């Protein structure tokens, strides 16, 4: 069947999802993630959207403001709205899968609720496609692809000019923060390109 989602766990607990369509396949994935890593995922959602002070307090206000100032939520929603129904299924399947398991947990918290929700004094909320997208945006795009020190570099350069004069300040800048160095060991050999 098309309604059927089979979940097989191996000797390490690693889940394997058997499904006939995209929505059912990502629903299965979403479901096991909510089973295995709900507190982690929940904290990862608040970290990537800047909503930690709500449950954790005063100490995270600066963190929350810094996260919100580094993105444009509306630009992310517009990319979601432009997806094709097959692409959209991935994200919707996933959020739906998670929600299915959050509903049972929230229904039977005396045995299903992750101990840390009790510790931290809050409970899990339902997910939407925007939330799934933000997990990737916040930890892959801002973690590994958002690197610059240009304002700082300018500050440094200004101090080198005040020390060695204008032309000298600039040549020292090139010695400390060169653009390229032809002796750098490379992944692609020079014969290749």
């Amino acid at each position: 069947s098309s309604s059927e989602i089979k979940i097989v766990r191996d000797e390490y607990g690693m889940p394997h999802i058997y499904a006939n369509d995209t929505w059912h396949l990502f629903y299965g994935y979403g479901y096991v993630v909510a089973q295995d890593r709900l507190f982690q995922m929940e904290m990862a959602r608040r970290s990537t959207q800047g909503t930690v002070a709500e449950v954790l307090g005063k100490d995270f206000v600066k963190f929350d403001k810094d996260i919100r100032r580094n993105y444009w939520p509306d630009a992310i929603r517009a990319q979601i709205a432009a997806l094709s129904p097959e692409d959209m299924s991935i994200l919707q399947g996933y959020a739906d899968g998670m929600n299915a398991w959050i509903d049972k947990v929230n229904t039977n918290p005396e045995t299903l609720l992750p101990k840390q929700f009790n510790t931290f004094g809050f409970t899990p909320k339902r997910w939407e496609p925007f939330d799934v997208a933000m997990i990737f945006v916040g930890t892959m795009a801002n973690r590994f692809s958002d690197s610059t020190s240009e304002i700082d570099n300018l500050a440094l350069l200004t101090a080198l000019k005040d020390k060695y004069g204008v032309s000298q300040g600039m040549a020292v800048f090139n010695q400390l923060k060169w653009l390229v160095n032809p002796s750098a060991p490379t992944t692609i050999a020079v014969q290749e390109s």
């Binding site: 979940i7 369509d21 295995d36 982690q40 002070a53 005063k58 570099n153 020292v172």
Partner: protein
């Protein structure tokens, strides 16, 4: 993050071998999540950070893929021109343009709420403003508006069956990331993926540009321009966040450089060493590189030359002889807390002293603090990520190369003194410092080993577990957060593919309300520490053969 890919011509008893060690820090519960997907055109196995829809590490029985951080320059800052009167406007192409703005309310558990505004221009969100210059800085990313497409390219690539299909997806991944390929036929490939700006002529990407119009990027460079190799003449592909290719410019970070001193050399040495490598040998490179001091190789010749005319009773000469006798591989003593040889401690003190006398001296305060680290700095929990050669150390290496270095020495870092005299002065400092703490008998120096901590707070500094959930490993290992190996066409099996991984502490982070910990909460922790690994299953018969449980759902959209 490191990776080594071995093709047909370098592989022994297989056609292709892929070993990946993504480095993101050590966390409890695991940074990555193990998952197999079978249906709707997908047939994959692997693990991926934060259980993203697409698997960063894994294979589909035909091809295998992996990643390492790219570090290309894909972000530039635009100095926006504001008017004192007419606020919330900026000058662009001779018109006063209005900024996008949004208000935000930060709700605070047990405190008052807080609201602020976020501003945005054509170039990007505003970082900071200088109302004295009447300048606002906007951070411009080449991948702005392709975030979602990058996620989907990472998902769709799992279905590729060849290089041709695989690169159609690589062309849509817009973040600066290295992608790797291997297949059942022994083919291997590499792509430095990402969206890079087509800059205006005379744009120096290390420094801000005016955002008034003339400095605006021309667009984005085509994918034909992205560094890539297929079936390289060497038989292998190695990366440890080094330069992709000759003359490729790195990130603008002051602290990031691609120079003659690079930790990828440590991988290359080992892969060129043996004409062919087996899977156990390819796996074994993790153990060696985990334990290798990264500075020994770079400055041993320099220290040797400087102490060559010194006497045997000279302590500065003794210290160099200790290092000469050493292979650079750190091993713990029986005590689980100290290293067998004092090499790293010596290089650490020497290097700190050397930096203070050379690079630090040439830079004005407080910019001098950016170049003073030796790269051994840690705490009680050990390093937060990988060990690397510090920026100051890469700059000092070029200086000690003298004229063999391609980098013009605008200021002589040795400030008119012969090299040997600065080296010997730093060696005197070293001896004075270390002998004071450990005594005069170098042979009984028991130096402190670095440790490994699986942190309860995620990389943002936000709790993702209870503090008590923190795990400790005695030996610091400069390796992936996870390690995975894929072997295509083993001669050793009937199986066309074999794959292994390790996801520590375990698959599950579940703790029941009563304090009852899941069965898979920490069953991979000891495996991690002793360089072990678990089989990854793809086919139904393997999965069936190894099943521990089954759950069937009947759901309709």
């Amino acid at each position: 993050s490191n990776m080594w890919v071995i093709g047909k011509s370098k592989a022994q008893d297989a056609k292709a071998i892929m070993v990946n060690g993504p480095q993101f820090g050590w966390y409890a519960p695991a940074y990555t999540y193990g998952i197999g997907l079978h249906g709707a055109g997908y047939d994959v196995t692997g693990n991926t950070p934060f259980a993203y829809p697409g698997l960063v590490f894994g294979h589909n029985g035909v091809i295998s893929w992996g990643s390492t951080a790219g570090f290309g320059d894909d972000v530039d800052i635009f100095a926006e021109r504001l008017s004192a009167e007419k606020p919330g406007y900026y000058l662009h192409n001779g018109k006063w343009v209005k900024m996008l703005s949004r208000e935000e309310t930060i709700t605070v558990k047990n405190g008052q709420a807080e609201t602020f505004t976020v501003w945005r221009t054509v170039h990007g969100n505003i970082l900071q403003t200088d109302q004295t210059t009447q300048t606002a800085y906007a951070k411009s990313r080449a991948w702005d508006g392709k975030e979602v497409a990058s996620l989907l390219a990472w998902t769709h690539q799992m279905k590729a069956k060849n290089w041709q299909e695989w690169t159609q997806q690589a062309a849509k991944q817009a973040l600066t990331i290295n992608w790797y390929y291997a297949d059942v036929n022994g083919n291997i490939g590499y792509v430095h993926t990402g969206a890079y700006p087509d800059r205006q002529s005379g744009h120096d990407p290390r420094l801000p540009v005016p955002g008034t119009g003339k400095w605006d990027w021309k667009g984005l460079l085509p994918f034909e321009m992205n560094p890539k190799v297929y079936n390289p003449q060497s038989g292998y592909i190695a990366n440890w966040n080094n330069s992709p290719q000759k003359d490729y410019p790195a990130s603008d970070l002051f602290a990031f450089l691609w120079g003659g001193a690079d930790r990828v050399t440590e991988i290359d040495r080992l892969l060129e060493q043996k004409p062919r490598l087996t899977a156990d040998q390819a796996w074994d490179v993790i153990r060696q590189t985990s334990r290798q001091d990264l500075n020994l190789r770079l400055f041993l010749p320099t220290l040797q030359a400087a102490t060559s005319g010194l006497t045997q009773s000279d302590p500065r000469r003794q210290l160099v002889e200790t290092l000469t006798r050493w292979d650079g591989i750190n091993l713990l003593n029986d005590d689980g807390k100290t290293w067998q040889q004092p090499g790293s401690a010596i290089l650490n003190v020497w290097l700190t002293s050397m930096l203070k006398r050379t690079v630090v001296a040439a830079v004005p305060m407080p910019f001098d603090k950016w170049y003073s680290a030796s790269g051994y700095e840690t705490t009680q929990d050990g390093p937060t990520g990988s060990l690397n050669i510090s920026v100051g150390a890469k700059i000092l290496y070029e200086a000690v190369q003298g004229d063999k270095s391609p980098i013009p020495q605008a200021v002589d870092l040795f400030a008119g003194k012969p090299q040997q005299e600065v080296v010997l002065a730093a060696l005197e400092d070293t001896w004075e410092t270390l002998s004071k703490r450990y005594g005069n008998n170098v042979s009984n120096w028991k130096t402190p080993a670095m440790a490994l901590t699986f942190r309860a707070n995620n990389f943002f500094g936000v709790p993702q577990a209870a503090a008590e959930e923190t795990r400790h490993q005695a030996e610091y290992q400069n390796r992936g957060t996870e390690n995975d190996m894929i072997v295509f066409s083993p001669t050793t099996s009937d199986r066309p593919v074999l794959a292994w991984d390790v996801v520590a502490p375990g698959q599950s982070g579940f703790i029941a309300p009563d304090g009852t910990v899941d069965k898979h909460y920490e069953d991979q922790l000891k495996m991690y520490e002793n360089f072990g690994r678990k089989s990854l299953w793809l086919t139904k018969q393997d999965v069936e053969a190894h099943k521990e449980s089954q759950e069937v759902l009947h759901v309709q959209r």
